[PDB]
Amino acid sequence: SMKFQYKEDHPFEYRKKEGEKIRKKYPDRVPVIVEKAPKARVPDLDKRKYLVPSDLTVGQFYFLIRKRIHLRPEDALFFFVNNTIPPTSATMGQLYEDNHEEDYFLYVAYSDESV
């Protein structure tokens, strides 16, 4: 029951129209909404909505987020999707297939704590 602002700020039917449009316009990409888990002691990620190549790996996405938020490299970083932590070698396309919500978006939280 993690809140995401894009969900908090728009009704379902608006989101689903928008996810379906973008999936129609970019069939080899997936739309992903990323937010820091609340009260995780890591920097916030300012840009929250991404259109990502389906073949991009979780680990590649980690590396992009780490750079953007200036995470020190001793610090850990984990994705949460529906309370699970995906394998670093999973693709974002597979993560989307397995977890996208009914508005056709994938919602990803992150923290430097896995537990």
């Binding site: 928008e18 973008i22 739309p31 840009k47 991404y50 259109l51 990502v52 190549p53 991009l56």
Partner: peptide, 10 residues
């Protein structure tokens, strides 16, 4: 950045 979604590559 199409429709406020940041387009990533790779």
């Amino acid at each position: 950045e199409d429709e406020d979604f940041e387009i990533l590559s790779l």
